[PDB]
Design a protein around this ligand. Structure first.
Ligand SMILES: *C(#N)C1=NN(C2=[C][C]=[C]C(C(F)(F)F)=[C]2)C(=O)N([C][C][C]N2[C][C][C][C][C]2)C1=O
Length: 215
């Protein structure tokens, strides 16, 4: 595995999205991971539909919450997920309106990385591509992150209240990090991104709930 990796440089990542006031981070996270695999498999990069997941993954709670694992399973069982263009994002609860004609990607299942194993997470990211992960993003410092490697001794790994996407990893002046793509718009963090402390005792619980879909 490379000392550092950044899948944005390998065309696996779409631009930052804005989930709005709907707690659908798990949908954007799942979609990001899926978009990466689709690119790896077909060579094409397309915006997948998070609203499709929000409205159709009954295993989850729509804007009220959910897990990326349930999303990947839905795509597999549903035999597909629509493109963002075929099922645009509104960030509001609506009955499922999935349409197979707009299908843009399928899923063969998913794998989970050993809970709290950042070493496993590193290897997974380097080999697979973008990986869905959960973190404690409740701290004010996270809300107003601007640059640098984010680290706060107050983060609680047991409080997984947000789902994001790890598109790579690296180091900055002795501080190892995870390159994280958020879904709170480009007006947050660094153009929507944030570098988070890596190998710092699983800061914010970044390795507690990480998984990726297979295609
Ligand atoms: C998103 N958006 C979102 N997700 N959760 C959540 C619940 C259970 C499990 C997960 C995950 F990612 F699978 F592990 C995620 C959640 O509780 N909320 C409420 C978030 C409140 N925010 C906390 C950080 C500060 C901003 C507000 C979600 O919105």
């Amino acid at each position: 595995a490379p000392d550092s990796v950044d899948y944005r440089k390998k065309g696996y990542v779409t631009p930052v999205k804005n989930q709005g006031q709907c707690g659908s981070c798990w949908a954007f996270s799942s979609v990001g991971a899926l978009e990466g695999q689709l690119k790896k498999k077909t060579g094409k990069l397309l915006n997948l539909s998070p609203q499709n997941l929000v409205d159709c993954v009954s295993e989850n709670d729509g804007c009220g919450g959910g897990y990326m694992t349930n999303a990947f399973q839905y795509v597999q069982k549903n035999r597909g997920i629509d493109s963002e263009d075929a099922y645009p994002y509104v960030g509001q609860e609506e009955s499922c309106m999935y349409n197979p004609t707009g299908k843009a990607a399928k899923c063969r299942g998913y794998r989970e990385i050993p809970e709290g194993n950042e070493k496993a997470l590193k290897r997974a990211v380097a080999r697979v591509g973008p990986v869905s992960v959960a973190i404690d993003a409740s701290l004010t410092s996270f809300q107003f992150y601007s640059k640098g490697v984010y680290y706060d001794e107050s983060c609680n790994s047991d409080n997984l209240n947000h789902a994001v996407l790890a598109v790579g990893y690296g180091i900055q002046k002795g501080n190892k990090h995870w390159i994280i793509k958020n879904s709170w718009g480009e007006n947050w963090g660094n153009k929507g991104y944030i570098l988070m402390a890596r190998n710092k005792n699983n800061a914010c619980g970044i390795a507690n709930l990480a998984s990726f879909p297979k295609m």
